Scaffold this motif. Structure first.
Motif: not given
Lengths: 52, 52
Positions: A43-52
């Motif tokens: 979850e953490q990585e995908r959320t980071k990348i969508v925020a990016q």
């Protein structure tokens, strides 16, 4: 001496068996926690990348 | 002094006593000793069994 020695002989199975149990009951929690924390990171990585 | 009849009587008393010893003295006591030898020697069986 027969009693004193056979005491250890009859007990060490119980004891070392319990510790062989314990080692695995830790390793199992390790596997379960890693399959949890890989979910947390999933979850953490995908959320980071969508925020990016 | 000289050859007698006494020889035969002594032969009878002799065999009487030999039987009266054979049956009711000798095994009765050798059994005692060797039974004590069993119970003494078999104490080692601890240091040869439980030790193992």
């Amino acid at each position: 001496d027969l009693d004193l020695a056979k005491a250890s002989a009859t007990d060490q199975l119980k004891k070392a068996k319990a510790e062989a149990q314990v080692i695995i009951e830790q390793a199992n929690k390790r596997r379960s926690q890693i399959l949890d924390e890989a979910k947390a990171e999933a979850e953490q990585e995908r959320t980071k990348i969508v925020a990016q | 002094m000289n050859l007698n009849a006494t020889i035969l009587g002594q032969a009878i008393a002799f065999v009487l006593f030999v039987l009266f010893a054979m049956k009711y003295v000798w095994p009765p006591l050798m059994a005692a000793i060797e039974k004590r030898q069993k119970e003494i020697a078999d104490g080692l069986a601890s240091a040869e069994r439980a030790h193992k």
